[PDB]
Amino acid sequence: SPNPPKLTKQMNAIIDTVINYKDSSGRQLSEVFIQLPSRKELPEYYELIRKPVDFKKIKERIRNHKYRSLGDLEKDVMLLCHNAQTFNLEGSQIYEDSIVLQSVFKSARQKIAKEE
Ligand SMILES: O=C(/C=C/N1[C@H]2CC[C@@H]1c1ncnc(NC3CC3)c1C2)c1ccccc1O
Ligand SMILES: [Zn+2]
């Protein structure tokens, strides 16, 4: 069945929490993840990463009712972070940031879906 308006709003709330999240230094960790470089700019990315995704795309998929559940949303966010861990050097800031955004997501999903 179609997504209730509340579900769509929870999804945007979760993702806005992730995007707007700032660490204890005030850096918005999501910045580099918003939009992938194009296939022309970084063909190496697409050679490696089978299922590219960025936060622009996730926002698109919320808007267009493509996630059937908050579990589907989570899967796409875990994919984004997995792709970042796959492409970027272990221990780089981008790798480390992706780990944190996993947690931020799981925290936000709980807070938003359980009311709290
Ligand atoms: O890994 C992601 C981004 C990667 N990079 C960003 C910053 C460092 C690295 C990079 N390496 C070389 N050329 C770079 N840019 C130049 C223009 C070619 C980029 C853009 C990513 C981004 C969004 C969602 C998921 C992701 O895995
Ligand atoms: Zn619609």
Ligand SMILES: [Zn+2]
């Ligand atoms: Zn994998």
